[PDB]
Amino acid sequence: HAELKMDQALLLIHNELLWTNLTVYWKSECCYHCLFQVLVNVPQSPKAGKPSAAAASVSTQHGSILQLNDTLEEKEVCRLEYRFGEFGNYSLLVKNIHEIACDLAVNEDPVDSNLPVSIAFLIGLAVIIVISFLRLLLSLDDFNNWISKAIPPRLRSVDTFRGIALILMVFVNYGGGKYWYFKHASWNGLTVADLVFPWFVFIMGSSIFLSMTSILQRGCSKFRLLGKIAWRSFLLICIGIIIVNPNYCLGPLSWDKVRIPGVLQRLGVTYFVVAVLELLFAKPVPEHCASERSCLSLRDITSSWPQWLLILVLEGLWLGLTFLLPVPGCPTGYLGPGGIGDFGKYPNCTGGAAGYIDRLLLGDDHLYQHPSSAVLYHTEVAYDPEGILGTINSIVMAFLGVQAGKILLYYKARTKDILIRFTAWCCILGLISVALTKVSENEGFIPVNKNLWSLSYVTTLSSFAFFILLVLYPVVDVKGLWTGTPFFYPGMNSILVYVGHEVFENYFPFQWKLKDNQSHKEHLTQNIVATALWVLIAYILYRKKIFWKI
Amino acid sequence: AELKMDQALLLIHNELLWTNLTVYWKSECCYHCLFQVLVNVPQSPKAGKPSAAAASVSTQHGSILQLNDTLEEKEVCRLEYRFGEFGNYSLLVKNIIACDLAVNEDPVDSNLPVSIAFLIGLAVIIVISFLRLLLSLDDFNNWISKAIALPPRLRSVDTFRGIALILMVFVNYGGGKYWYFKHASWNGLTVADLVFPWFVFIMGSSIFLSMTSILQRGCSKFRLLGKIAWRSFLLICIGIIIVNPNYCLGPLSWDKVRIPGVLQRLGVTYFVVAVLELLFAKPVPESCLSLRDITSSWPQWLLILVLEGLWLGLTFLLPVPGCPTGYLGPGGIGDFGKYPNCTGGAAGYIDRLLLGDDHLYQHPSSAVLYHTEVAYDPEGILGTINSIVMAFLGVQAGKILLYYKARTKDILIRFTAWCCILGLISVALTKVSENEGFIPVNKNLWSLSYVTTLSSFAFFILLVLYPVVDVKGLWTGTPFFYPGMNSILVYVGHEVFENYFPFQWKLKDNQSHKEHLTQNIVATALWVLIAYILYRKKIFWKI
Ligand SMILES: CC(C)(COP(=O)(O)OP(=O)(O)OC[C@H]1O[C@@H](n2cnc3c(N)ncnc32)[C@H](O)[C@@H]1OP(=O)(O)O)[C@@H](O)C(=O)NCCC(=O)NCCS
Ligand SMILES: CC(C)(COP(=O)(O)OP(=O)(O)OC[C@H]1O[C@@H](n2cnc3c(N)ncnc32)[C@H](O)[C@@H]1OP(=O)(O)O)[C@@H](O)C(=O)NCCC(=O)NCCS
Ligand SMILES: *[C@@H]1O[C@H](CO)[C@@H](O[C@@H]2O[C@H](CO)[C@@H](O)[C@H](O)[C@H]2NC(C)=O)[C@H](O)[C@H]1NC(C)=O
Ligand SMILES: CC(=O)N[C@H]1[C@H](Oc2ccc3c(C)cc(=O)oc3c2)O[C@H](CO)[C@@H](O)[C@@H]1O
Ligand SMILES: CC(=O)N[C@H]1[C@H](Oc2ccc3c(C)cc(=O)oc3c2)O[C@H](CO)[C@@H](O)[C@@H]1O
Ligand SMILES: *[C@@H]1O[C@H](CO)[C@@H](O)[C@H](O)[C@H]1NC(C)=O
Ligand SMILES: *[C@@H]1O[C@H](CO)[C@@H](O)[C@H](O)[C@H]1NC(C)=O
Ligand SMILES: *[C@@H]1O[C@H](CO)[C@@H](O)[C@H](O)[C@H]1NC(C)=O
Ligand SMILES: *[C@@H]1O[C@H](CO)[C@@H](O)[C@H](O)[C@H]1NC(C)=O
Ligand SMILES: *[C@@H]1O[C@H](CO)[C@@H](O)[C@H](O)[C@H]1NC(C)=O
């Protein structure tokens, strides 16, 4: 409604005081321990009855804490903790009451982002898009008729899970309407965009076990499956480094500024490690005890105890490196965001041990230069979310996916046992996560961090994945009440969809110029249309059996 | 240092204290250009101290310099030297009025055998590296076990298309930024200008070679018409969406979308010529001079002649407002600058009238030389007629290849006859001159002489490829038909992956031909390798 943009409310401040230099400090409520950034400097009023006013633009995404203290006296005047709307015209008046108090007034009502659209506009847009697609499909055959008138099967629950993850990833990678909850969490906590990648690693591990056991029971030597695993991991790493990581619109690729790690690099490294582990210890899948009712046998874990032992050793290594690796110019065992986080006393300390290891082994230029904490915590250093330390927890979560595959493939005709074990695993992983985080975004022993790929992050997302599998496997596999109707085509063409949406970022169907580039509705509509078009492309590549696999 | 690629720093010293000298430059290859001012050199402040002015002159080909006084407006000397890349030329002029132009530093001249011998050396090095990398694949693994469509594709059309694809991948990436590996500014023929017409010719030949097989094997005409229409629509949509816009500048908008394009023109011509062939389709029949391939296509020939007449009439007779009728010139400063905004003439006027100025090629091939300020699309509306004509010439080549399958001599005789006829037509039209003649060879207008010249070249290439690769089998096209079978995928990939690392990386110095040429050769070799890899796995993409 003004020169504002993208969750930014203009806050006029009337310094009605006569002889006080007033400065205005602001800090979002999302910050755990952040410095009070300077917002605006409102000078003293020249005379009584003629206040001096200045214009400042506060944020809107999540809360706002305003601190007013005298610039010269360095004494607090008053504090506010308002939640300014998207395009509000809030006005703050500070004046003597008789000591000094500030009054906040809402000159113009906010647009109330996500309140107006809520679910009503979402349902309306979905219905309109569906009607338009159906009309286009029906009228498409009209042109063809005018001329005539003139003269071991793939598991479907895993496919639906991967399709859900892929749809969510395509939505949140394109922006997801540029909403704060559809983007990545700044440093800690969990958002909608933070869920997909751990789910992808979990499904990768489950598919690793499924494919491994299917190929081995087909009568194939381990020395050929090892070559397949190594080649697939190498292809993943190379594809990521060459195609996915760099933004070639900026310019040609130069090794001095090549981002070595990435999503596909991490996927390939973890795939190689966990698949080679499973190949090394690959027990044949045994038949059930013919009861299949409420069997308590833990043969699934007692047949994979070496893999579990090595995974726990790796997790202990991750904990030791995170909490006991002296980082120069940084507290040992740091988990904060740096920049202005933790009151700003460690500005060049994003990540801590993981960031130090990344900057040491790979160099500062070979890391993600725009980490998710840069926007909020003002981190000036380069931290890569897919670093080296986090690869250990990525391997751990891939192995948890392997465990889920073991659960769902050992007891193939014992769906009650499958659900019992999925419930048990979800419960125990949730208990571990709730012990580590203590139900807190930034408190607890190990908060839910994606950039660090925290152990609590892995446990929380693995519990979510186990619950999702518990919901999907009966409905989509056993009961058959559902088939993942809009989901499993991306589930089958995951790699194709990922590579395509990484390449065809700005292409017209997935991205077009907007009338209002600072509108949430326009961005959300564009991102939803792009996601729906990627689902349509995956469905087309399913109808014509074009399944790209590595 | 301060110089750029294909430029020489021309120092100019004037020993005259009574006449300021302004320096006018004009490239030798331009037909009729205004003498654009190069540098203004003031008079010498005192005797024995000539004023020094430094200017950079294009060294690609020719440099006509005229010095005339800025006050008396009278010329003092004229020189037509052809400078060299990264040179250092000092031009001293004194009252004796004569101009010396003594060269100080010898030019690098990267267009010299440093682009031939070095190219061969780079190719040898790349081949050796690839062979060494491929050799150590199975031997190491073995040593580690101790520690533990009724007829086949012609392959001549495929080799021709593969040559065209290699050329397009090389010259689209820049081709070393050489002047002869780019599109000639308006009239003229270069290595880049030869690619697209060959693609249209091969498209027509494949149109016939596939249409007759489809009709003879198991299919009807209505399903084939549906397939032709769907393929044309797909090509047009791909050209509009994926290929034409360069999305690195931002999201697509309708006010800045280029409606014409390479694939749009190919799809439109495919639709038109394939529909004509399907409508007038007759079985192929099994004589030193039969002439059946024309008696069996006389209706299509009549339609093509009518289309050619329409193209000629529109080009030479459509009244362009604020422009002479029958204008084949480039506008800008071309044709003595009397038509600053007339690029294309009738074809450009039709494009701007129908599709609008905003939906055209913002940066045509004449902007670099003739300084045109208007938008002219080489793949416009009017040139589609000549594209259809050459697609039908390719269809005629396919008719020759398919009628006389039994008698190879009956194919070579027709090929040499058609090549000679089209070469004679082109010689008559252009008067063996790039800028003279009735209709000079011009890719931007897709001139009729351009179509005839490139079709004669294509007929000669087919006449030298069909025997060698098919009749006696001297040489299958080892680096050629692998892209020949994946043409559409190769084009789409190099139109999508222009900037990706294997095909493009950062250079030590962007103003160097030995670097750009190596980059483009590596990219083309990698595209040939990718097409070969897809051929090995049989992942051919069609439609
Ligand atoms: C890389 C990626 C394809 C690996 O996932 P996957 O589950 O291993 O995917 P694929 O379908 O490629 O699986 C490969 C093999 O898994 C096996 N498999 C997969 N699903 C299976 C199932 N439901 N039942 C049995 N086997 C299965 C098969 O053997 C398949 O190969 P085959 O069909 O040739 O035998 C996938 O995780 C991905 O697309 N990642 C990129 C997305 C991402 O990481 N996003 C993060 C945010 S950017
Ligand atoms: C592929 C392209 C050249 C035109 O297609 P084509 O020449 O007809 O080749 P395709 O490989 O698409 O083949 C299409 C048909 O020709 C057939 N065909 C091609 N060569 C053949 C041969 N030698 N013998 C028999 N049939 C042949 C194919 O089998 C297919 O027929 P089907 O319908 O029976 O499957 C075109 O789409 C393209 O690549 N354009 C980009 C290149 C370009 O224009 N560059 C300009 C510079 S940017
Ligand atoms: C705004 O002014 C208040 C009032 O002084 C500051 O509060 C104290 O500032 C001193 C700095 O001299 C600190 O040592 C104290 O810890 C602060 N708190 C208390 C309770 O005394 C406040 O810090 C000022 N704002 C900023 C951003 O510095
Ligand atoms: C769900 C998610 O965002 N995952 C990873 C993320 O993927 C992305 C992130 C952003 C984009 C962008 C901006 C556009 C696009 O079209 O493609 C993307 C893909 O890239 C970062 C590492 O490269 C990490 O923050 C995340 O692990
Ligand atoms: C030999 C040839 O390719 N000619 C066509 C030409 O191709 C090009 C030209 C330029 C580029 C560029 C700039 C980058 C790229 O990576 O791709 C290209 C492809 O595009 C113009 C119309 O689009 C016309 O001059 C011709 O039809
Ligand atoms: C407030 O600051 C201004 C300079 O920005 C200064 O001129 C003025 O005197 C200050 N007010 C007081 C009361 O010191
Ligand atoms: C906010 O309200 C004040 C009150 O007068 C007004 O002057 C100002 O223009 C308003 N802001 C906008 C953006 O309309
Ligand atoms: C050359 O140009 C200068 C401008 O600096 C001018 O003063 C001088 O008169 C000119 N020479 C002649 C001969 O007019
Ligand atoms: C330079 O001066 C000469 C002298 O008359 C003139 O003929 C020529 O056209 C001039 N060059 C231009 C105007 O480009
Ligand atoms: C060109 O030669 C002159 C005369 O020797 C010299 O002063 C000048 O620096 C040279 N230019 C370059 C770029 O070396």
Swiss-Prot record, chain A:
Annotated consequence of substituting C349S: Complete loss of intralysosomal proteolytic cleavage and enzymatic activity. Reduced oligomer formation
Result of altering P152Q: In MPS3C; likely benign; does not influence stability; does not influence activity; does not influence cellular localization of the enzyme
Reported effect, L68P: In MPS3C; shows practically no enzyme activity
Annotated effect of mutating W318C: In MPS3C; results in a negligible amount of protein synthesis; very low enzyme activity; retained in the endoplasmic reticulum
Region spans: Lysosomal targeting region: 511-522
EC class (word): transferase
Glycan-modified residues: N21, N69, N89
InterPro entries: HGSNAT_cat
Tissue: Widely expressed, with highest level in leukocytes, heart, liver, skeletal muscle, lung, placenta and liver.
Subcellular location: Lysosome membrane
Catalytic activity as recorded in UniProt: alpha-D-glucosaminyl-[heparan sulfate](n) + acetyl-CoA = N-acetyl-alpha-D-glucosaminyl-[heparan sulfate](n) + CoA + H(+)
Topological region Cytoplasmic: 211-232, 283-307, 409-416, 473-479, 543-550
Description of post-translational modifications: Undergoes intralysosomal proteolytic cleavage; occurs within the end of the first and/or the beginning of the second luminal domain and is essential for the activation of the enzyme. Glycosylated.
A single GO BP: lysosomal transport
Record annotation: effect of changing S456L: In MPS3C; results in a negligible amount of protein synthesis; very low enzyme activity
Effect of P486L: In MPS3C; results in a negligible amount of protein synthesis; very low enzyme activity
Transmembrane segments: 114-134, 163-183, 190-210, 233-253, 262-282, 308-328, 388-408, 417-437, 452-472, 480-500, 522-542
GO terms for cellular component: lysosomal lumen; lysosomal membrane; plasma membrane; specific granule membrane; tertiary granule membrane
Note: A signal sequence is predicted but has been shown not to be cleaved in the endoplasmic reticulum.
Protein's UniProt name: Heparan-alpha-glucosaminide N-acetyltransferase
Organism: Homo sapiens
